[PDB]
Structures are given as structure tokens and as C-alpha cells.
Design a protein around this ligand. Structure first.
Ligand SMILES: [Mg+2]
Ligand SMILES: [Mg+2]
Ligand SMILES: [Mg+2]
Ligand SMILES: [Mg+2]
Ligand SMILES: [Mg+2]
Ligand SMILES: [Mg+2]
Ligand SMILES: [Mg+2]
Ligand SMILES: [Mg+2]
Ligand SMILES: [Zn+2]
Lengths: 83, 102, 24, 137, 135, 214
RNA sequence: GUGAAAUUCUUGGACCGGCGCAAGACGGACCAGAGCGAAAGCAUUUGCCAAGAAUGUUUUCAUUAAUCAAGAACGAAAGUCGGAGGUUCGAAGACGAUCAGAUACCGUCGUAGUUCCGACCAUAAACGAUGCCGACCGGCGAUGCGGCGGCGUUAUUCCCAUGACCCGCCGGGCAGCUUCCGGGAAACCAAAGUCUUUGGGUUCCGGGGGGAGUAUGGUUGCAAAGCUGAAACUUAAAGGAAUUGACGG
């Protein structure tokens, strides 16, 4: 392939490439909002949280820090923020 | 001239590999350099299986095997004819020789 | 001569030379 | 009297045969079932007088034949096998006399039980003799 | 033991087969009697050696298609090849077993919704690829 | 000059009640002379005897020791001394492209017998696996080793030696070990390769009689 | 025990079989063109002590960096010093064989040593015979670690997580197969390429073969020795890679 359009890559190969090796850098992480059952507060947590996030209104754990991505405690709902 | 790319051994990302003694002449040889043969021989000769089966106190008795791992230095390996010299192109192949089942 | 044995011979000779020099 | 055990006909008595089939010589030792008490032991070296054939298959054949004759005369009619090589830090393959010895024990009419390799395998041994350059021949 | 025919006799035999296949029979002595007039042979020994190889070759011809050309076998070969079109097309299947993914490809090629097509149930397991190494 | 075998008498050897084939075999000893009593001559003998000639239709690679400690009449009374596997089976079980998890633990029974149990564990490649090797990571191996070291204790501590003997006859310990570790890393070929008697409790006679009798 | 023997141990029970006791080495098979470490090197279980890469990261400082005379740490084996221990193996040494001779290869015995602690030495074909950092330049299938995404299978449980396989993707590694990328004297090398179309940064280092890694001086060392290191003289070749032939116990 001697004529690859390096300057309009389709989002597929753009997304599968490494974050720094993208044409313009884009973090793979994001922010999500998490819903503990029985709580009204909408807690915004990092998708790669390294710490134990907690509800200020109830003593329960929300995400378990893991290698790359925080693992959300079961029974919790989450949706993407602004894609 | 460099005869073999791997220098006649399998040591790649290591500095030192512990040695073993050749089973034939008791020469120290690096473990990956040595030729290893895993011989699985019947404990009895095929010509004596019938005699042992007839002289057995059991009816369906399976013959035990003989599980032995052999290490040769390449001197003994070439001398005992387990390995052979090959052409320059044939040295580039690593496929084990065929079993010859029929 | 194998280079190792030439080296060993030369080391012997150097020891002897140092000995004779020390005797003076 | 026959110097034997009081046994029936449809059943049989079992001894233990230790074949130390090294090179340079072979052993056709036969003991009792516990192994402490021995019945008869003949070697290939006591059946040839040439010192070359002490590990030859024929010497083991003669020794196994005489062990069989002695055991039958005493009243032992079945044997287990515990084959052994030199072992230790030395070689693990049995000598040439193992095969002929076992074939002779079978052919002589003696019955055979469990066959087992009991060669002394080290979890790790001392330094094997010969030096790091081996046995130059 | 020491009965290998050379190129000379073999080539002469093949040439007279491909020239005089019609005028030859399975007999040795009949085939040795034609080589005097269909050729010039300096020796009687070489003549009957060629005759024997001709008998062998044409026995093989009657048994199979030897690489020495046989005109009749050429026409049966020809009529096999450039003929026998079956009455029904081997590519006119009333139903064709089709991938859902290739069905999606066909509708992206505007050829979805065709009656002769049946959507195969895609397999499950993804167990292709041979096991690596021995065992 | 005369043979010593005219001076030898024959004795029977009896397995415990744990084994249905009680009749192990016959062993001989020299008759009694002087102070050299034959009773002590029988005592302290091991009878390295298999399992299939002790039980009925079980595996042939299991192997038992059966020390002799008392003789009465023309019979020897034997008690469990240790079990192990055959050379052939053990060395066939080891294969390349898979890891061996071995564990040992020293444990005392309820009645004072002290035992050293050794266990082997082999990693099983899945039936649909394409990867040539089936290796477990070091922490996985450590977890399996700790799991089996934990589980062999409670099969020995809380209970007596005779039922230990008849429960390692089917190697239910090894089957349980295989079943416990599937959630960590699948195993396939798990046996208690060896046990060796370390200490014994003073040889109570009544225990021996009820082990042979009822 | 050997090719064959012999030295050697043996009716005072040697070899062999059994049960124990003790000692010191060594951690088989699993063990891989696999992992880790700056290299040397590192493989029985468990615990403890600190340490590290890669990965992950919309964390932080903001050029703090790369390479490096002098200098410094570590540095296989062997060797040296002091103290324990000395099973096996085994320089030196002794003997038996072999031989024309055999100060050897072979067999038997055996000191130092080989093992642990402490202290030296600073050398190896210490090799990838191949400096480090950075960028670019073909493909393919694997493999180790980490992360991400998915048909399905399996393990408990009632399901998801979590493991074990399957299929891909990314980052860092150990490598492999293929290629008229290109390079080279070629062997070969995806680096030994992007070098007469010669310049990314930087350290060391060679100038025909011997003499010679010698002499002398300096310096380190308990020593053995290590670092630095000539000249006279001699020589027309010495070498590297491939081709053909001859020869091969
Ligand atoms: Mg060469
Ligand atoms: Mg090295
Ligand atoms: Mg030779
Ligand atoms: Mg050292
Ligand atoms: Mg000392
Ligand atoms: Mg010795
Ligand atoms: Mg630079
Ligand atoms: Mg010069
Ligand atoms: Zn060798």
C-alpha cells in the first residue's frame, strides 16, 4: 500500500492505534456517572480510578481499582458522559 | 565463518545455562546445547512379549514401559549416529525426523 | 605452540626474570 | 518334604526377583516377598569364566535358568520382577542381560507377576566421575 | 539383471508406435516383421530388441494411456474434454447456502431479498486453526 | 555343609481389615535357636505390595508398604506403613509443555501416627486449546499448592488412621483436590504420590487386634 | 572395572537383598530457541526484608536529558588469606594397563580444591566475536507480561465478576519464518540498512605480519598477577570470505 491517506484515517484504524500514535492524541479513558442502589447522589468517577471512591451519604464501595479500569461494584448503573 | 545462527544452542535471552553431564561420556555440556532423546521402550523385547504374557499370573496385564531421558554431547551424538551432518541448506530445518509408522 | 601454552611459558619466564632481578 | 510351604494346587506362592542388570555383570537375585530374606542369588559372572561375558545375555540366561531350578526345587512357583540398572549419578538403561534373564525365567516355566523398574533415580546426585571433559575415547 | 533398454531402442519404439499404431499387433514375431520395411535397422539384435519393447509398450497402451501418443486415445480424450456438458447446470442450484455476513454484503451490493437464497445459521465456537506444535 | 533352608519355617502374612484380600503371601525365617528368637526375626519387615492384589478391581499403579510388627501362630500381623506410586506411572505422568505442582505437609492423626503426605498436580490443556503449552503462573501455582496443603490436613487431622487408609485407597483426597482447584486453574492428573510413616504410637496391642479382627 | 585386562575389595563374608543411623554435597524429570537481572548470573516448599520492568493513568514537576577523560560499585571459574565442614568428584601424587617410549588419553586410589562465613584478585571465546540514545524503513505466524474488546465452552451459584480455553487489538520484551528494502569481499545482516546521493548526538578503539602484550619505568596486589606499555631487529606477505580438486583413523 503505497498510497495510504495518512491525513484522513477512518475512525477504525484511528481508534485501534495507540493513544500517542494517533494522528492527534486522544485519551482512551473517560468520565462516567455511577448510581449506587438506594442512593440519589450521582457520583462522577474516572473510568480508570486508582482509589476507592465512596458515597458521602452511605458507607459503601463503588469502584474497585484494578490494573487498567476501575471495576464497578455490582448493582451499580453507569452511563457515558458526552461520549 | 558463523556456521549456525543460533551458535549450536537455544540460549537466546540468557547469560548462563546450568550444565548437564552427557549420559554416554559424562562430559559437562550446557543443557540447551545437549542433544535430548526421550526414549520410551517396552520393558520387555517385542520377541519376548508372548513368552511373558503366557508366563504371567494375570490374564490382561499391560507391560510397563521404560521412561528415560537421554542427554548426549554432540561428540557422542554424532558418534552414536543419532544425529547426522547435513547440507548447508538442510541445516536450516528443525523438523524432527518422521516416526515411520508403517 | 598453542597460544595458551605460549602465554603460560612466558609467565614462567617473567617470574624467573623477576627472581633474577630481585637477587641483585 | 521338598523344603517347601504347605500350599494348595490351584493357587501359588510368590517370590520377589531383583534383576540388577548393569553393564559388566548381571544379577539374578531372588528374595522372599518382604525382600529381607533371600532364596538364591546367581550372577552372570559365576556362570562364565571369560570376564567379557559377565554382562552378556547368555550368562544372564544361564543364571536365570539356575535361579528358576533352585526356586522350583525349594517350592517357589511365581515371581515378581524389580528390574534395576546401575542408577545413581551413573546410567539408567538396564544392561544387556535383563532381557535374556527375564525371558529365561519365563521360558523355564516360572510364573510372572508385577514388573517394575526400581533403578535408583536421584532427585539430584553428587558430581559424576569423569571430569568436565568426560571420558575421552 | 542387465536388461535395461537404452534411449535408442525406446525412442525408436515410441516413434514407430506413434507412426504405425494401426499396423501393429500384440505378437512379438509379427512386430519384428514390420520393422524391416517401416525402417532401416543396421542390426538384427537391435531390430528384435525394438520389437520386444514395442510389444511391451503396446500391451501398456491397451492397458492404459502411455505418454507415447495414441491417435485413438487422443480422440477419446478430446471428446471427453470438449464435450459432455450435462443437461442441467451444476451452477443452477435452486437454493444456495449463504452466510448472514455475505447476505449483508449482498444487500450492501443491492442484491438483498432474492428468493433463491437461504440464510445459513452461522456456526458457533470459532474452533478453527490447528493445534500448534506436536501433541 | 547342609543347606540352611532345611532350618527355615514358613509364615503367613495378613493384611489389615481395610483390605479384602487378607492373604498377602508367605515369608520364611530360620527356626529358633539359642537367643535368636524367630518372633523378633519376623518383626520389622516391610511387604512392598501392590493395590490390585490387596483390593479387588482398583488401580494397579498404587503401591503399599505394610510393615510387620507382631507375629502370633503362623501368621504375621501387618499395619499400614506407607503408600506410593509406581516408577512407571509417576514418570509417565510427567510431560512437557505443562507444569507440575507438588506439595508436602506433615500431619499427625488422632491416634498419634505422624504422616508426610506428598501430592502432585498437573496442568490440563483444554480440549479446544490451540496453544501448545498449558502453564500456570507462579501465583496460580502457589495458590494451588496452598489449597492442597490446606485440604490434605483436614482429611488426616480430624480422624483416625484406619479410615485414612481406606479413604486413600480410592484416592478421594486427590479427586477432591482436582475438584477444588478447577476454579483457579484446571488440573487433570492429581494423585497423592507418596506417604511415609514418621512416628508410631508405642504399638498398642488391642489396636492391632481390632485392626486385624473386629 | 576394561576394547581386553590388571591395580583394587573378597569364607575374617566382598558384591547383592532388607531395616535403620549419620554426614556433606546437589536440587532430576516439569525445563522451553521460555522469564528475570547491568552483566557475571538466577530452578525444592514456606515466611520475611527491601528493590524493578512493562502495563494502566484527563496524577505531578517542567527540560530536570543522551553520551561520557578522571573516579566509583559489581564482576563466572580458577587462585590467595582466616575460621568451620569435608559426602561425592578430583589439579598435584601413587599404582595398574596401553605403547617402540607413555612423564598422557583408559582403570584404581588420592592431596589442594570443590561446600558455608569473612576478606582479597579483577581476569574469560566476560560472545551476539556486533557501544549507548533517537527517528525512519516490508510482510507473516507464534511466544512472555500488562491493558482493552468480543461468538461461544468450562469451574461454584441463582446470575454476573473471577479464573481456564477461543478470537482479535495495543504497548514493552525474547526470538523465529519470508523478502531483489537496502548493504556487504562474501558468509550473511530487517540491521551489519537508510554511506561518494558520503554530516542525528556521543564514548572507546585499529593502521601489514612478527618482535610483543615483551623490556624498562610508573602503579595496584599477601601472592599469583592486574593496569599502563616501547625500541632495536626481522619479514613480502601474514590474513578474511567463497569456488574447484585432493584427502579424512
Ligand atoms: Mg570450521
Ligand atoms: Mg557469558
Ligand atoms: Mg573420538
Ligand atoms: Mg569464584
Ligand atoms: Mg581454607
Ligand atoms: Mg575417586
Ligand atoms: Mg552518538
Ligand atoms: Mg602493524
Ligand atoms: Zn558424550
Amino acid at each position: 500500500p503505497l498510497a495510504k491517506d495518512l491525513l484522513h484515517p477512518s475512525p477504525e484504524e484511528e481508534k485501534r492505534k495507540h493513544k500517542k500514535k494517533r494522528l492527534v492524541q486522544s485519551p482512551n479513558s473517560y468520565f462516567m456517572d455511577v448510581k449506587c442502589p438506594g442512593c440519589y447522589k450521582i457520583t462522577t468517577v474516572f473510568s480508570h480510578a486508582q482509589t476507592v471512591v465512596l458515597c458521602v451519604g452511605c458507607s459503601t464501595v463503588l469502584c474497585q481499582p484494578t490494573g487498567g479500569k476501575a471495576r464497578l461494584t455490582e448493582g451499580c448503573s453507569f452511563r457515558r458522559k458526552q461520549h | 565463518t558463523k556456521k549456525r545462527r543460533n551458535n549450536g544452542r537455544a540460549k537466546k535471552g540468557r547469560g548462563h545455562v546450568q550444565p548437564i553431564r552427557c549420559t554416554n561420556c559424562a562430559r559437562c555440556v550446557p543443557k540447551d546445547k545437549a542433544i535430548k532423546k526421550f526414549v520410551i521402550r517396552n520393558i520387555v523385547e517385542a520377541a519376548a512379549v508372548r513368552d511373558i504374557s503366557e508366563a504371567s499370573v494375570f490374564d490382561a496385564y499391560v507391560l510397563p514401559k521404560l521412561y528415560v531421558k537421554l542427554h548426549y554431547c554432540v561428540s557422542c551424538a554424532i558418534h552414536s549416529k543419532v544425529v547426522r551432518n547435513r547440507s548447508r541448506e538442510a541445516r536450516k530445518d528443525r523438523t524432527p525426523p518422521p516416526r515411520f509408522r508403517p | 605452540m598453542r597460544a595458551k601454552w605460549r602465554k603460560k611459558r612466558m609467565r614462567r619466564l617473567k617470574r624467573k626474570r623477576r627472581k633474577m632481578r630481585q637477587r641483585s | 518334604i521338598s523344603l517347601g510351604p504347605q500350599v494348595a494346587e490351584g493357587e501359588n506362592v510368590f517370590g520377589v526377583c531383583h534383576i540388577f542388570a548393569s553393564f559388566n555383570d548381571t544379577f539374578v537375585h531372588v528374595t522372599d516377598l518382604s525382600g529381607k530374606e533371600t532364596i538364591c542369588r546367581v550372577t552372570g559372572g559365576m556362570k562364565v569364566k571369560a570376564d567379557r561375558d559377565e554382562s552378556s545375555p547368555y550368562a544372564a540366561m544361564l543364571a536365570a535358568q539356575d535361579v528358576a531350578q533352585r526356586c522350583k526345587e525349594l517350592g517357589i512357583t511365581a515371581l515378581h520382577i524389580k528390574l534395576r540398572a546401575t542408577g545413581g549419578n551413573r546410567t539408567k538403561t538396564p544392561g544387556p542381560g535383563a532381557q535374556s534373564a527375564l525371558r529365561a525365567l519365563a521360558r523355564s516355566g516360572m510364573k510372572i507377576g508385577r514388573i517394575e523398574d526400581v533403578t535408583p533415580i536421584p532427585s539430584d546426585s553428587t558430581r559424576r566421575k569423569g571430569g568436565r571433559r568426560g571420558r575421552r575415547l | 539383471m542387465g536388461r535395461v533398454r537404452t534411449k535408442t531402442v525406446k525412442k525408436a519404439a515410441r516413434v514407430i508406435i506413434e507412426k504405425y499404431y494401426t499396423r501393429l499387433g500384440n505378437d512379438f514375431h509379427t512386430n519384428k516383421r514390420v520393422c524391416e520395411e517401416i525402417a532401416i535397422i543396421p542390426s538384427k539384435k537391435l531390430r528384435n530388441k525394438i520389437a520386444g519393447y514395442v510389444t511391451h509398450l503396446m500391451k501398456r497402451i491397451q492397458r492404459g494411456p502411455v505418454r507415447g501418443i495414441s491417435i485413438k486415445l487422443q480422440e477419446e480424450e478430446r471428446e471427453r474434454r470438449d464435450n459432455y456438458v450435462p443437461e442441467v447446470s451444476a451452477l443452477d442450484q435452486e437454493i444456495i447456502e449463504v452466510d448472514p455476513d455475505t447476505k449483508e454484503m449482498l444487500k450492501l451490493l443491492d442484491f438483498g431479498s432474492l428468493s433463491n437464497l437461504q440464510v445459513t445459521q452461522p456456526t458457533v465456537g470459532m474452533n478453527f486453526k490447528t493445534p500448534r506444535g506436536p501433541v | 555343609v547342609v543347606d540352611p533352608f532345611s532350618k527355615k519355617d514358613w509364615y503367613d502374612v495378613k493384611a489389615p481389615a481395610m483390605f479384602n484380600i487378607r492373604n498377602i503371601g508367605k515369608t520364611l525365617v530360620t527356626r529358633t535357636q539359642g537367643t535368636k528368637i524367630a518372633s523378633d526375626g519376623l518383626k520389622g519387615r516391610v511387604f512392598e505390595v501392590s493395590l490390585a492384589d490387596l483390593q479387588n478391581d482398583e488401580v494397579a499403579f498404587r503401591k503399599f508398604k505394610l510393615i510387620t510388627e507382631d507375629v502370633q501362630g503362623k501368621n504375621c500381623l501387618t499395619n499400614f506403613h506407607g503408600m506410593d506410586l509406581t516408577r512407571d506411572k509417576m514418570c509417565s505422568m510427567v510431560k512437557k509443555w505443562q507444569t507440575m505442582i507438588e506439595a508436602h505437609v506433615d500431619v499427625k492423626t488422632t491416634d498419634g501416627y505422624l504422616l508426610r503426605l506428598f501430592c502432585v498436580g498437573f496442568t490440563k490443556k483444554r480440549n479446544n486449546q490451540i496453544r501448545k503449552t498449558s502453564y500456570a503462573q507462579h501465583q496460580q501455582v502457589r495458590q494451588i499448592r496452598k489449597k492442597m496443603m490446606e485440604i490434605m490436613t483436614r482429611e488426616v487431622q480430624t480422624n483416625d488412621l484406619k479410615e485414612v487408609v481406606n479413604k486413600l485407597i480410592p484416592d478421594s483426597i486427590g479427586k477432591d483436590i482436582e475438584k477444588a482447584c478447577q476454579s483457579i486453574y484446571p488440573l487433570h492428573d492429581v494423585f497423592v504420590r507418596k506417604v511415609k510413616m514418621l512416628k508410631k504410637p508405642k504399638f498398642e496391642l488391642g489396636k492391632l487386634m481390632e485392626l486385624h479382627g473386629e
